[PDB]
Amino acid sequence: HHHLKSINHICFSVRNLNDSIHFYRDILLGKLLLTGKKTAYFELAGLWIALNEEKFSYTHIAFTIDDSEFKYWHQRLKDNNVNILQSIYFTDPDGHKLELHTGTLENRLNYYPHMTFY
Amino acid sequence: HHLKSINHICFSVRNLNDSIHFYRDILLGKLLLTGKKTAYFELAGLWIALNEEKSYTHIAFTIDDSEFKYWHQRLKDNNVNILEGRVRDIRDRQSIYFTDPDGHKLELHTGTLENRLNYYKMTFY
């Protein structure tokens, strides 16, 4: 009893809202829901993302894709000049670190001997 | 051809034991795995990886209205760094803003995306 229920949304600061809208809505195929003065809201991978215009290495957000889609995503990111760093590692136009994976994190947990599993 | 779901989020932290206490004891997540400089948790259905390493972003979780006071008191009782929100965010049981031991800003909210959309009803797509 008493648990946080779910993720509610993520918020990212961005230098240029138009560049970020083409990245999230066209290259990553998220749904644009609303725009305002210096803001945009998307639904992407079931997650509300809020971008805030204000004209780094200590966090990343990873997303799951169908493994049969891996070549489609790698080619899509490559052919849209995305900064690329089975798994794909990349950034958005501001440098926020993102990743695509074709397996759950739990399935990696099953992969890993001197670690301690709970 | 759509991304399916969130896989996990990762944060770098200065002190793994202090972050385990924050995400697992205070926020009631579950510790799933540790390695020399690493810990993984499940929190609110989300997998969180922490990497020990000796603003531009925030992450928000949903809580029920009926649990707002429980959470606000729990964070205060644990000396968590609480940040100011809008006027009436506390009294109207809307939002709590705070940070983890490293400064990563987090939020608890009782309202969803549809509630925010209805509320704003800016350009609506």
The CATH number that applies at residue B100 is 3.10.180.10
Which residue, chain included where needed, has tokens 């992450």? B59
Residue type, A79: D
CA atoms within 13 A on the CB side of A48: 21
A9 is in an annotated binding site: yes
The CA distance from B125 to A76, in Å, is 25
CA distances, A44 to each of A55, A96, B23, B45, B86 (Å) = 23, 15, 25, 17, 27
Rounded CA-CA distance B77/B26 in Å is 10
Stated in angstroms to one decimal place, the resolution of this structure is 1.6
Exposure on the CB side of residue B13, measured as CA atoms within 13 A: 25
Nearest CA in chain A to B110: A8
Number of domains in chain B: 1
Experimental technique: X-ray
Give me the domain span that covers residue A60: 1-115
Give, as one character, the DSSP assignment of residue B87: T
Q: Kindly determine whether residue A109 and residue B33, on different chains, have CB atoms separated by under 8 Å.
A: yes
Q: Give, in order, the Cα–Cα distances in Å from A21 to each of A30, A32, A85, B117, B118.
A: 9, 8, 22, 18, 22
Distance CA B24, CA A79 (A): 41
A6, A44, A58: residue with CB nearest B11: A58
Query: Chain B 64-83, CB below 8 Å of chain A: which residues?
Result: 64, 67, 70-71
